[PDB]
From a paper:
To this end, we co-crystallized wild-type (WT) 70S ribosomes from the Gram-negative bacterium Thermus thermophilus (Tth) with HygA and one of the three macrolides (ERY, azithromycin (AZI), or TEL) and determined their structures at 2.5–2.6 Å resolution. In this experiment, we used Tth 70S ribosomes complexed with E. coli protein Y (PY) as a tool to obtain structures of higher resolution. The obtained electron density maps revealed all three drug pairs bound to their previously known binding sites on the 70S ribosome. Consistent with the previous structure, HygA binds in the A-site cleft of the PTC on the large ribosomal subunit with its aromatic ring sandwiched between nucleotides A2451 and C2452 of the 23S rRNA, and is oriented such that the aminocyclitol group protrudes toward nucleotide C2573, while the fucofuranose ring extends into the ribosome exit tunnel. Most importantly, the presence of a neighboring macrolide (either ERY, AZI, or TEL) does not affect the binding position of HygA, in which it interferes with the full accommodation of the amino acid moiety of an incoming aminoacyl-tRNA (aa-tRNA) into the ribosomal A site, resulting in inhibition of peptide bond formation. In all three structures of macrolides in combination with HygA, the desosamine moiety of a macrolide forms two hydrogen bonds (H-bonds), which were suggested to be crucial for macrolide binding: one between the hydroxyl group of the desosamine and the N1 atom of the nucleotide A2058, and the second one between the dimethylamino group of desosamine sugar and the N6 atom of A2058 via a water molecule that is also coordinated by the phosphate of G2505. Although ribosome-bound HygA and either of the macrolides (ERY, AZI, or TEL) do not form H-bonds with each other, their fucofuranose and desosamine groups, respectively, come into physical proximity and form van der Waals contacts.
Newly-made proteins emerge from the ribosome through the nascent peptide exit tunnel (NPET) that spans the body of the large ribosomal subunit beginning at the PTC and ending on the opposite side of the large ribosomal subunit facing the cytoplasm. Here, we discover that well-known ribosomal antibiotics, hygromycin A (HygA) and macrolides, which target peptidyl transferase center and peptide exit tunnel, respectively, can act cooperatively against susceptible and drug-resistant bacteria.
Residue numbers in the entry:
A (entry chain 17): 1 to 48
B (entry chain 1D): 2 to 276
Amino acid sequence: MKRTWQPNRRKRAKTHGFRARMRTPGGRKVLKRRRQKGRWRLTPAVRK
Amino acid sequence: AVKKFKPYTPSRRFMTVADFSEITKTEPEKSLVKPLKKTGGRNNQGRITVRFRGGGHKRLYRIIDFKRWDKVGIPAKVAAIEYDPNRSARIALLHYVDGEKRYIIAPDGLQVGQQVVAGPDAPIQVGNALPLRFIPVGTVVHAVELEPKKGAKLARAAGTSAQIQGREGDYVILRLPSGELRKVHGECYATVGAVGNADHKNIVLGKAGRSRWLGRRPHVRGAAMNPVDHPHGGGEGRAPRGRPPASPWGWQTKGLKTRKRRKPSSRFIIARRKK
RNA sequence: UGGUUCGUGGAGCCAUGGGGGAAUCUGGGCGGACCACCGCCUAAGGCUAAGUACUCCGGGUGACCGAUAGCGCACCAGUAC
RNA sequence: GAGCUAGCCCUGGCCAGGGUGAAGCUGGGGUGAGACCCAGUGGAGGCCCGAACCGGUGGGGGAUGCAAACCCCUCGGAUGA
RNA sequence: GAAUGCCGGCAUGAGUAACGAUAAAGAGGGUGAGAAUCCCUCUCGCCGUAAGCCCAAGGGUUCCUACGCAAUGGUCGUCAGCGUAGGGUUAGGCGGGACCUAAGGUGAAGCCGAAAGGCGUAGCCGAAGGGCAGCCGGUUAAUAUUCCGGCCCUUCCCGCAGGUGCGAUGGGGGGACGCUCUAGGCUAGGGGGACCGGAGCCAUGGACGAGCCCGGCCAGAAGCGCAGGGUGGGAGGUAGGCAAAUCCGCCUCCCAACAAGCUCUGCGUGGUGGGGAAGCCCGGGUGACAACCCCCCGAAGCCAGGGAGCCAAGAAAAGCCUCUAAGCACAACCUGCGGGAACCCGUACCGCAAACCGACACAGGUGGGCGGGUGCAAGAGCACUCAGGCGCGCGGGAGAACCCUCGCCAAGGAACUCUGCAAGUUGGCCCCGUAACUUCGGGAGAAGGGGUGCUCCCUGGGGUGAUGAGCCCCGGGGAGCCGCAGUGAACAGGCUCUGGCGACUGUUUACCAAAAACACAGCUCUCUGCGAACUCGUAAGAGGAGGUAUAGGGAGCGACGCUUGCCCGGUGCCGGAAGGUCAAGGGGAGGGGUGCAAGCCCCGAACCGAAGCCCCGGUGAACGGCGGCCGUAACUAUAACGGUCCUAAGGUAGCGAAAUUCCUUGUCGGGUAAGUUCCGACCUGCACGAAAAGCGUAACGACCGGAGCGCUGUCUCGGCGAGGG
RNA sequence: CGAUGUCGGCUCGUCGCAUCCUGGGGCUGAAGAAGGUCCCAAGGGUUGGGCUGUUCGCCCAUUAAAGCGGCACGCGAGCUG
RNA sequence: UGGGAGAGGGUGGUGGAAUUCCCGGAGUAGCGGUGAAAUGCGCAGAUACCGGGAGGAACGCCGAUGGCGAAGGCAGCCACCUGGUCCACCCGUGACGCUGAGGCGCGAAAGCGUGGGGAGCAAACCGGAUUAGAUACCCGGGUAGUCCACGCCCUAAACG
RNA sequence: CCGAGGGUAGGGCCCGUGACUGGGGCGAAGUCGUAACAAGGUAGCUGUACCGGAAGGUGCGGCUGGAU
Ligand SMILES: [Mg+2]
Ligand SMILES: [Mg+2]
Ligand SMILES: [Mg+2]
Ligand SMILES: [Mg+2]
Ligand SMILES: [Mg+2]
Ligand SMILES: [Mg+2]
Ligand SMILES: [Mg+2]
Ligand SMILES: [Mg+2]
Ligand SMILES: [Mg+2]
Ligand SMILES: [Mg+2]
Ligand SMILES: [Mg+2]
Ligand SMILES: [Mg+2]
Ligand SMILES: [Mg+2]
Ligand SMILES: [Mg+2]
Ligand SMILES: [Mg+2]
Ligand SMILES: [Mg+2]
Ligand SMILES: [Mg+2]
Ligand SMILES: [Mg+2]
Ligand SMILES: [Mg+2]
Ligand SMILES: [Mg+2]
Ligand SMILES: [Mg+2]
Ligand SMILES: [Mg+2]
Ligand SMILES: [Mg+2]
Ligand SMILES: [Mg+2]
Ligand SMILES: [Mg+2]
Ligand SMILES: [Mg+2]
Ligand SMILES: [Mg+2]
Ligand SMILES: [Mg+2]
Ligand SMILES: [Mg+2]
Ligand SMILES: [Mg+2]
Ligand SMILES: [Mg+2]
Ligand SMILES: [Mg+2]
Ligand SMILES: [Mg+2]
Ligand SMILES: [Mg+2]
Ligand SMILES: [Mg+2]
Ligand SMILES: [Mg+2]
Ligand SMILES: [Mg+2]
Ligand SMILES: [Mg+2]
Ligand SMILES: [Mg+2]
Ligand SMILES: [Mg+2]
Ligand SMILES: [Mg+2]
Ligand SMILES: [Mg+2]
Ligand SMILES: [Mg+2]
Ligand SMILES: [Mg+2]
Ligand SMILES: [Mg+2]
Ligand SMILES: [Mg+2]
Ligand SMILES: [Mg+2]
Ligand SMILES: [Mg+2]
Ligand SMILES: [Mg+2]
Ligand SMILES: [Mg+2]
Ligand SMILES: [Mg+2]
Ligand SMILES: [Mg+2]
Ligand SMILES: [Mg+2]
Ligand SMILES: [Mg+2]
Ligand SMILES: [Mg+2]
Ligand SMILES: [Mg+2]
Ligand SMILES: [Mg+2]
Ligand SMILES: [Mg+2]
Ligand SMILES: [Mg+2]
Ligand SMILES: [Mg+2]
Ligand SMILES: [Mg+2]
Ligand SMILES: [Mg+2]
Ligand SMILES: [Mg+2]
Ligand SMILES: [Mg+2]
Ligand SMILES: [Mg+2]
Ligand SMILES: [Mg+2]
Ligand SMILES: [Mg+2]
Ligand SMILES: [Mg+2]
Ligand SMILES: [Mg+2]
Ligand SMILES: [Mg+2]
Ligand SMILES: [Mg+2]
Ligand SMILES: [Mg+2]
Ligand SMILES: [Mg+2]
Ligand SMILES: [Mg+2]
Ligand SMILES: [Mg+2]
Ligand SMILES: [Mg+2]
Ligand SMILES: [Mg+2]
Ligand SMILES: [Mg+2]
Ligand SMILES: [Mg+2]
Ligand SMILES: [Mg+2]
Ligand SMILES: [Mg+2]
Ligand SMILES: [Mg+2]
Ligand SMILES: [Mg+2]
Ligand SMILES: [Mg+2]
Ligand SMILES: [Mg+2]
Ligand SMILES: [Mg+2]
Ligand SMILES: [Mg+2]
Ligand SMILES: [Mg+2]
Ligand SMILES: [Mg+2]
Ligand SMILES: [Mg+2]
Ligand SMILES: [Mg+2]
Ligand SMILES: [Mg+2]
Ligand SMILES: [Mg+2]
Ligand SMILES: [Mg+2]
Ligand SMILES: [Mg+2]
Ligand SMILES: [Mg+2]
Ligand SMILES: [Mg+2]
Ligand SMILES: [Mg+2]
Ligand SMILES: [Mg+2]
Ligand SMILES: [Mg+2]
Ligand SMILES: [Mg+2]
Ligand SMILES: [Mg+2]
Ligand SMILES: [Mg+2]
Ligand SMILES: [Mg+2]
Ligand SMILES: [Mg+2]
Ligand SMILES: [Mg+2]
Ligand SMILES: [Mg+2]
Ligand SMILES: [Mg+2]
Ligand SMILES: [Mg+2]
Ligand SMILES: [Mg+2]
Ligand SMILES: [Mg+2]
Ligand SMILES: [Mg+2]
Ligand SMILES: [Mg+2]
Ligand SMILES: [Mg+2]
Ligand SMILES: [Mg+2]
Ligand SMILES: [Mg+2]
Ligand SMILES: [Mg+2]
Ligand SMILES: [Mg+2]
Ligand SMILES: [Mg+2]
Ligand SMILES: [Mg+2]
Ligand SMILES: [Mg+2]
Ligand SMILES: [Mg+2]
Ligand SMILES: [Mg+2]
Ligand SMILES: [Mg+2]
Ligand SMILES: [Mg+2]
Ligand SMILES: [Mg+2]
Ligand SMILES: [Mg+2]
Ligand SMILES: [Mg+2]
Ligand SMILES: [Mg+2]
Ligand SMILES: [Mg+2]
Ligand SMILES: [Mg+2]
Ligand SMILES: [Mg+2]
Ligand SMILES: [Mg+2]
Ligand SMILES: [Mg+2]
Ligand SMILES: [Mg+2]
Ligand SMILES: [Mg+2]
Ligand SMILES: [Mg+2]
Ligand SMILES: [Mg+2]
Ligand SMILES: [Mg+2]
Ligand SMILES: [Mg+2]
Ligand SMILES: [Mg+2]
Ligand SMILES: [Mg+2]
Ligand SMILES: [Mg+2]
Ligand SMILES: [Mg+2]
Ligand SMILES: [Mg+2]
Ligand SMILES: [Mg+2]
Ligand SMILES: [Mg+2]
Ligand SMILES: [Mg+2]
Ligand SMILES: [Mg+2]
Ligand SMILES: [Mg+2]
Ligand SMILES: [Mg+2]
Ligand SMILES: [Mg+2]
Ligand SMILES: [Mg+2]
Ligand SMILES: [Mg+2]
Ligand SMILES: [Mg+2]
Ligand SMILES: [Mg+2]
Ligand SMILES: [Mg+2]
Ligand SMILES: [Mg+2]
Ligand SMILES: [Mg+2]
Ligand SMILES: [Mg+2]
Ligand SMILES: [Mg+2]
Ligand SMILES: [Mg+2]
Ligand SMILES: [Mg+2]
Ligand SMILES: [Mg+2]
Ligand SMILES: [Mg+2]
Ligand SMILES: [Mg+2]
Ligand SMILES: [Mg+2]
Ligand SMILES: [Mg+2]
Ligand SMILES: [Mg+2]
Ligand SMILES: [Mg+2]
Ligand SMILES: [Mg+2]
Ligand SMILES: [Mg+2]
Ligand SMILES: [Mg+2]
Ligand SMILES: [Mg+2]
Ligand SMILES: [Mg+2]
Ligand SMILES: [Mg+2]
Ligand SMILES: [Mg+2]
Ligand SMILES: [Mg+2]
Ligand SMILES: [Mg+2]
Ligand SMILES: [Mg+2]
Ligand SMILES: [Mg+2]
Ligand SMILES: [Mg+2]
Ligand SMILES: [Mg+2]
Ligand SMILES: [Mg+2]
Ligand SMILES: [Mg+2]
Ligand SMILES: [Mg+2]
Ligand SMILES: [Mg+2]
Ligand SMILES: [Mg+2]
Ligand SMILES: [Mg+2]
Ligand SMILES: [Mg+2]
Ligand SMILES: [Mg+2]
Ligand SMILES: [Mg+2]
Ligand SMILES: [Mg+2]
Ligand SMILES: [Mg+2]
Ligand SMILES: [Mg+2]
Ligand SMILES: [Mg+2]
Ligand SMILES: [Mg+2]
Ligand SMILES: [Mg+2]
Ligand SMILES: [Mg+2]
Ligand SMILES: [Mg+2]
Ligand SMILES: [Mg+2]
Ligand SMILES: [Mg+2]
Ligand SMILES: [Mg+2]
Ligand SMILES: [Mg+2]
Ligand SMILES: [Mg+2]
Ligand SMILES: [Mg+2]
Ligand SMILES: [Mg+2]
Ligand SMILES: [Mg+2]
Ligand SMILES: [Mg+2]
Ligand SMILES: [Mg+2]
Ligand SMILES: [Mg+2]
Ligand SMILES: [Mg+2]
Ligand SMILES: [Mg+2]
Ligand SMILES: [Mg+2]
Ligand SMILES: [Mg+2]
Ligand SMILES: [Mg+2]
Ligand SMILES: [Mg+2]
Ligand SMILES: [Mg+2]
Ligand SMILES: [Mg+2]
Ligand SMILES: [Mg+2]
Ligand SMILES: [Mg+2]
Ligand SMILES: [Mg+2]
Ligand SMILES: [Mg+2]
Ligand SMILES: [Mg+2]
Ligand SMILES: [Mg+2]
Ligand SMILES: [Mg+2]
Ligand SMILES: [Mg+2]
Ligand SMILES: [Mg+2]
Ligand SMILES: [Mg+2]
Ligand SMILES: [Mg+2]
Ligand SMILES: [Mg+2]
Ligand SMILES: [Mg+2]
Ligand SMILES: [Mg+2]
Ligand SMILES: [Mg+2]
Ligand SMILES: [Mg+2]
Ligand SMILES: [Mg+2]
Ligand SMILES: [Mg+2]
Ligand SMILES: [Mg+2]
Ligand SMILES: [Mg+2]
Ligand SMILES: [Mg+2]
Ligand SMILES: [Mg+2]
Ligand SMILES: [Mg+2]
Ligand SMILES: [Mg+2]
Ligand SMILES: [Mg+2]
Ligand SMILES: [Mg+2]
Ligand SMILES: [Mg+2]
Ligand SMILES: [Mg+2]
Ligand SMILES: [Mg+2]
Ligand SMILES: [Mg+2]
Ligand SMILES: [Mg+2]
Ligand SMILES: [Mg+2]
Ligand SMILES: [Mg+2]
Ligand SMILES: [Mg+2]
Ligand SMILES: [Mg+2]
Ligand SMILES: [Mg+2]
Ligand SMILES: [Mg+2]
Ligand SMILES: [Mg+2]
Ligand SMILES: [Mg+2]
Ligand SMILES: [Mg+2]
Ligand SMILES: [Mg+2]
Ligand SMILES: [Mg+2]
Ligand SMILES: [Mg+2]
Ligand SMILES: [Mg+2]
Ligand SMILES: [Mg+2]
């Protein structure tokens, strides 16, 4: 049947993207935390 | 007159439709329509604030002239009478000798080809508009302003009207559609005659589908819900109300008056509505 | 109403959201209701090192660990997944 | 977190074929004029039968499955909320 | 040594289950260390509204070639979507951007919020919508509307020539719109040809034939032709389209008007460029100087912004045209022609799937287009089959029980069982014929029955032609032939009688309930006079509504028919300027601390002092409620009648052992040989009853009861057979 | 209670005997035939249907007879539900 | 052809008295009702009086034993539209007539449907009396309805 | 071919009968009240409508076949 992951690149970038996170207080705290942890990727990589 | 159908479906047995007999033109003036942004009953937060709205037929909004004292002394010809999906009354397209075209709401008995005009000097005939000072006591009227130059507010739906009952100083006394008696400022404009399409209220939708065409989604009784949802919710099997009948938000709904008491307009309302 | 040890208590002191509303030393605040006496102090402008805190970083040293321990990672780890 | 799901909003798309034959219209009849009746025309409808499409009625199978809801047979809607 | 402890390792179950659709395989030849599994050939089967082809998501080198087989592959492997390496994606015209706007998002001005932030007209961003210039063919191992070939086209810059009051982010036009149905003429696509081109074939009894088999086109500027779309012209006045206007709108006049004319698209033609089958021969040659023509069918596509009807009344903005404003009128713009200029990103491959979502090379899920032929009434249904693609990544045997899916069955025919659960029966089309009841639509495909193939002969109307033949479509009548059987295979209702509940089509517990539940038109109560009530938000701001009492909110009830009684003492709601109670505050009689004092400070009586409550009324489609006992009539029985306690008042009409009845399988009647169920009655209703509506009601229901006919392996009662295990 | 699945039906039995029938007996208010009552006896047998989920029971038509109990109210890693 | 009388019918308008309600004023201890009473209403200011407003229905006098119509039935006043009928002239037509089974139309009140309107009155209903009792007669309240439009119903002591 | 009739199926009319139910007639020796005939103690009768144990009542409109 139809499952939960229906990939959509524009949706991905617009929802979890770098400019999405930076627009908002909680989104920058995500970036601060992910940078503090040493994550190689601060944000999901969608091909574009 | 309203039009019936033969019972060739279970819904056509009861469906009735407006005959549309006064309508002389089936397309709207392109310069007077604009898109009507459908809300679905949702507000600027995205939240439902009026339940069970949405899904109706697409509509363009006809720009109506609810001021009329714009063009004192300038006569206009009644060029057409049109359907308006945004209101129960019909609309009439006016052709001012100015060259300017405007929509008013069509009074009862308005004739295409006749002339109307607005102003303190207008004759007391259907379609003309005057400040209330100059309309004779007893004449029935519509598209009444509430305050001067703020636009027609009262008696706007199909078949409705108000009656001038007398004068008192700077104000005239109107019997509003609801039966209320109200002072209204004499400089407020009005339009002589009743609103047209008085058969509007004899329409029988006939089927659930018809309501849906109009943007009315199904209504859910509180008694069919659960206690999380509604005061009337829950109960094992069916259940009487078991408390004073209440809205989804807990307030009582059988008689509880809700007009604010200290409202400044009370100094102008003589007698609360009848019936 | 808050702060203080003070939770309405005899409840002062310091702060102030509302109302009323002064004086310039013979002016004014405080000494735990309040009054007198006796003292202390100078509100409604601002600044000021040092002694104090912390440990991303550098070093020194362990009756600290020794690869299931010690940091999640001694190794290409905030990786693979 | 509404890329699942629920509702709404904007903008596009889809619905083989067959059946029934409403109003209206034209003609004829009728009448003082009408109502109305008959025929032809017509093509209405949360109309009918049935694929796509949307479903999930009863049974059987499956049950460390092909599958964390599937398969076969049957069955509901299919111009409409 | 134990914590169903934690991490790791290794056992048991066990050579067991399984190896992922029952579309299916066999042989020969090759390669190789090794072959059921790789390559090649022949034979067989399966899909063909797909299991074929194209496009968009998503995936991201999986594409091509060489060399490999440790692992990955449910076996094997020499093979591969795997390992290594090299190569491969070419655009002014295709898609997106240097254009437009939609919801929405953002957001100068502005507004609001302790902070963070929330809003917000314009503007901007935002597409699969508007707009915009490329078709056919060839070529690579792998790209092609991109390279090449032929023929076309767009914008920008500059110049030349003619022309004009030129000029805009401003004004106006236009862009610009629904659903259903549909005309004319075309194109796509298809069928036939005794005609045109073609390598060949004559088998096994016959045929050298009007034989078989194969193919008989594609693109194309201007011009022309056919078919459609769009659009009236002139003058005069003008106060409106936030300036101006010659434009547009309005009034008037005059010609024109279903015409023509001007313009635009489609189709045909068209210089020109291409393609080109079967067979044969080792993807390529040949066929071939290939031929390339006539007839019929015909779109849901095209002309298109076509036409009609209908109510639920159907985006925006830019491009485009027109008007004028500053300005500028050696400029500028318009038209023609010529040269130059023309950027960025995508393009491989998979794409109903082994490359996407499902941990898997997973019987599941995935939006748009093409989707041939014949026959069956039609069709995208069904059977077979074309092009194209496959035989589903374990096999070989055997022929037990049992299981699964399937076929048949003597006599009986529901006796099975909770229940005909399941499975039979019925089954399309044409004709005949069809009941109660009914809201006059229906019920209805009611029920029930007859016909159905092929052959010859006669014949009627239509379509295309031309009026004819030919082709295609719809029929009619007569006489015959064969079989058990003619929708001869496949796809295709079993029917009726009678209750309950719900009017109806719809909706629901994604994944145990589809229903009598929710919704529904419709009924009533109630609130709301507009800066509405009400909802969201601290607010600003929104929704309501660019609506205005024939409207909007809340509640119950639930088509329709006939109806909806009595109780306002309690609670609710509504009304009541009296009265009672009533907090802060006002007031300050009187009292207290302290001071030598004037004075400072504290307590405090009467009285004044809101809403609310109390109090007085009203109100039931507001919350709710709606009795008991004794007695009485020519036999008994019962009680129309009287008496009496209690209550706010004591259940009306209608219905009743009921979706409600405990006693209960109540009693009586019907149906059955026999009926705890069913239907009809009665009424001592444990414990119906009138909008948590009462009683009915045609039609409707994958709802739940009861009965009958038809027919059956459900059964007496079992047997045999098939295929996958 | 870190789980001992439940009524009824179907299937499959096996056992007890306080015996329903068949076999053997005593008594009889046993003439015969038919019965009554008690004793011995468990080898075998103990039907098909209507109602109801029912066990049970009632009823129909038969029968030599239409027995009663136990086995986790026998039997759901055997089925039904 | 020329005249007449008339509440004959339909549509649109419009006038005054009275009843009730609301507002203002003034005023106070009762009003109302009956055979007599009580319920009811009234110091929360009634009744009685004056001024203002709203609204519905019916039209006093004229009015008669009268007029009109086929019947039912028709009553303020104005206008429009329209029927029947009588009279005088004796002008035209030339028996064109009478009746009338079926048909069609009309048809008081009550009742029905959809919508409006609602002052007064008033079935049902509630209360007070009366009475042996009183589901009545009398009194205080009161919903349909009574009124308007359109569609039904089609009855009568529709009687002379 | 037709064809007595038989068979399957569906309709129409008539008769008998049926748990139970509606009223009607008669009986009369009962219970309740007294609706009509007199102004019958509320003049009566009436079509209709709503209501009540019963006769009946009330509303609306009509008749006199109504006493004074
Ligand atoms: Mg997942
Ligand atoms: Mg999706
Ligand atoms: Mg993905
Ligand atoms: Mg995307
Ligand atoms: Mg996208
Ligand atoms: Mg998206
Ligand atoms: Mg982003
Ligand atoms: Mg990571
Ligand atoms: Mg890195
Ligand atoms: Mg992130
Ligand atoms: Mg009309
Ligand atoms: Mg109708
Ligand atoms: Mg109709
Ligand atoms: Mg009709
Ligand atoms: Mg119906
Ligand atoms: Mg109509
Ligand atoms: Mg109209
Ligand atoms: Mg339109
Ligand atoms: Mg526009
Ligand atoms: Mg709008
Ligand atoms: Mg809006
Ligand atoms: Mg917004
Ligand atoms: Mg938001
Ligand atoms: Mg949000
Ligand atoms: Mg709401
Ligand atoms: Mg809504
Ligand atoms: Mg309208
Ligand atoms: Mg209308
Ligand atoms: Mg209605
Ligand atoms: Mg609508
Ligand atoms: Mg609604
Ligand atoms: Mg509802
Ligand atoms: Mg519920
Ligand atoms: Mg919740
Ligand atoms: Mg709660
Ligand atoms: Mg609650
Ligand atoms: Mg409740
Ligand atoms: Mg409930
Ligand atoms: Mg309850
Ligand atoms: Mg419930
Ligand atoms: Mg209950
Ligand atoms: Mg409930
Ligand atoms: Mg319910
Ligand atoms: Mg309850
Ligand atoms: Mg209730
Ligand atoms: Mg309650
Ligand atoms: Mg106001
Ligand atoms: Mg203390
Ligand atoms: Mg303190
Ligand atoms: Mg302060
Ligand atoms: Mg001092
Ligand atoms: Mg001092
Ligand atoms: Mg101080
Ligand atoms: Mg101090
Ligand atoms: Mg001290
Ligand atoms: Mg000090
Ligand atoms: Mg220092
Ligand atoms: Mg320091
Ligand atoms: Mg150590
Ligand atoms: Mg060490
Ligand atoms: Mg280690
Ligand atoms: Mg470690
Ligand atoms: Mg480290
Ligand atoms: Mg480690
Ligand atoms: Mg690593
Ligand atoms: Mg759209
Ligand atoms: Mg369809
Ligand atoms: Mg027809
Ligand atoms: Mg028509
Ligand atoms: Mg349908
Ligand atoms: Mg249909
Ligand atoms: Mg259908
Ligand atoms: Mg769906
Ligand atoms: Mg199913
Ligand atoms: Mg089945
Ligand atoms: Mg089966
Ligand atoms: Mg199963
Ligand atoms: Mg499972
Ligand atoms: Mg399946
Ligand atoms: Mg299936
Ligand atoms: Mg089916
Ligand atoms: Mg269907
Ligand atoms: Mg269809
Ligand atoms: Mg439908
Ligand atoms: Mg729709
Ligand atoms: Mg131990
Ligand atoms: Mg374990
Ligand atoms: Mg264990
Ligand atoms: Mg462990
Ligand atoms: Mg462990
Ligand atoms: Mg092992
Ligand atoms: Mg073995
Ligand atoms: Mg084993
Ligand atoms: Mg398998
Ligand atoms: Mg091999
Ligand atoms: Mg090998
Ligand atoms: Mg091969
Ligand atoms: Mg991937
Ligand atoms: Mg490639
Ligand atoms: Mg590769
Ligand atoms: Mg390998
Ligand atoms: Mg190997
Ligand atoms: Mg290997
Ligand atoms: Mg492997
Ligand atoms: Mg595998
Ligand atoms: Mg090799
Ligand atoms: Mg592979
Ligand atoms: Mg290479
Ligand atoms: Mg090119
Ligand atoms: Mg550029
Ligand atoms: Mg833009
Ligand atoms: Mg675009
Ligand atoms: Mg393009
Ligand atoms: Mg081209
Ligand atoms: Mg290539
Ligand atoms: Mg438009
Ligand atoms: Mg559009
Ligand atoms: Mg539609
Ligand atoms: Mg056509
Ligand atoms: Mg072509
Ligand atoms: Mg064809
Ligand atoms: Mg031969
Ligand atoms: Mg043509
Ligand atoms: Mg002008
Ligand atoms: Mg062409
Ligand atoms: Mg060739
Ligand atoms: Mg050649
Ligand atoms: Mg040659
Ligand atoms: Mg040749
Ligand atoms: Mg079509
Ligand atoms: Mg059109
Ligand atoms: Mg409408
Ligand atoms: Mg816009
Ligand atoms: Mg200038
Ligand atoms: Mg020009
Ligand atoms: Mg650039
Ligand atoms: Mg690029
Ligand atoms: Mg490419
Ligand atoms: Mg699929
Ligand atoms: Mg596979
Ligand atoms: Mg798959
Ligand atoms: Mg094709
Ligand atoms: Mg067929
Ligand atoms: Mg067919
Ligand atoms: Mg099919
Ligand atoms: Mg074929
Ligand atoms: Mg296979
Ligand atoms: Mg074997
Ligand atoms: Mg199979
Ligand atoms: Mg058999
Ligand atoms: Mg049978
Ligand atoms: Mg039989
Ligand atoms: Mg049954
Ligand atoms: Mg069958
Ligand atoms: Mg069949
Ligand atoms: Mg029948
Ligand atoms: Mg009928
Ligand atoms: Mg129907
Ligand atoms: Mg039937
Ligand atoms: Mg044959
Ligand atoms: Mg056969
Ligand atoms: Mg088949
Ligand atoms: Mg069928
Ligand atoms: Mg059956
Ligand atoms: Mg039936
Ligand atoms: Mg029912
Ligand atoms: Mg239903
Ligand atoms: Mg239901
Ligand atoms: Mg109903
Ligand atoms: Mg309903
Ligand atoms: Mg329904
Ligand atoms: Mg449907
Ligand atoms: Mg479920
Ligand atoms: Mg569930
Ligand atoms: Mg779940
Ligand atoms: Mg669930
Ligand atoms: Mg299920
Ligand atoms: Mg369910
Ligand atoms: Mg269903
Ligand atoms: Mg539900
Ligand atoms: Mg419901
Ligand atoms: Mg109703
Ligand atoms: Mg709130
Ligand atoms: Mg706002
Ligand atoms: Mg708004
Ligand atoms: Mg708005
Ligand atoms: Mg509104
Ligand atoms: Mg409902
Ligand atoms: Mg009926
Ligand atoms: Mg009663
Ligand atoms: Mg009460
Ligand atoms: Mg009360
Ligand atoms: Mg009371
Ligand atoms: Mg209560
Ligand atoms: Mg004092
Ligand atoms: Mg003292
Ligand atoms: Mg009521
Ligand atoms: Mg109570
Ligand atoms: Mg209630
Ligand atoms: Mg007695
Ligand atoms: Mg009762
Ligand atoms: Mg009973
Ligand atoms: Mg019974
Ligand atoms: Mg019942
Ligand atoms: Mg009960
Ligand atoms: Mg009980
Ligand atoms: Mg019972
Ligand atoms: Mg019982
Ligand atoms: Mg019984
Ligand atoms: Mg039963
Ligand atoms: Mg039952
Ligand atoms: Mg009884
Ligand atoms: Mg309820
Ligand atoms: Mg109920
Ligand atoms: Mg249903
Ligand atoms: Mg159903
Ligand atoms: Mg049968
Ligand atoms: Mg069997
Ligand atoms: Mg066999
Ligand atoms: Mg077998
Ligand atoms: Mg086999
Ligand atoms: Mg076998
Ligand atoms: Mg336990
Ligand atoms: Mg355990
Ligand atoms: Mg366990
Ligand atoms: Mg004897
Ligand atoms: Mg013995
Ligand atoms: Mg024995
Ligand atoms: Mg034994
Ligand atoms: Mg039994
Ligand atoms: Mg029993
Ligand atoms: Mg018994
Ligand atoms: Mg015997
Ligand atoms: Mg036992
Ligand atoms: Mg026991
Ligand atoms: Mg027991
Ligand atoms: Mg047991
Ligand atoms: Mg058991
Ligand atoms: Mg089990
Ligand atoms: Mg069991
Ligand atoms: Mg077990
Ligand atoms: Mg066990
Ligand atoms: Mg069972
Ligand atoms: Mg169960
Ligand atoms: Mg007083
Ligand atoms: Mg008189
Ligand atoms: Mg004469
Ligand atoms: Mg009448
Ligand atoms: Mg009447
Ligand atoms: Mg009234
Ligand atoms: Mg009534
Ligand atoms: Mg009524
Ligand atoms: Mg009436
Ligand atoms: Mg008379
Ligand atoms: Mg015979
Ligand atoms: Mg015979
Ligand atoms: Mg009397
Ligand atoms: Mg009497
Ligand atoms: Mg009398
Ligand atoms: Mg009664
Ligand atoms: Mg009584
Ligand atoms: Mg009475
Ligand atoms: Mg009369
Ligand atoms: Mg008399």
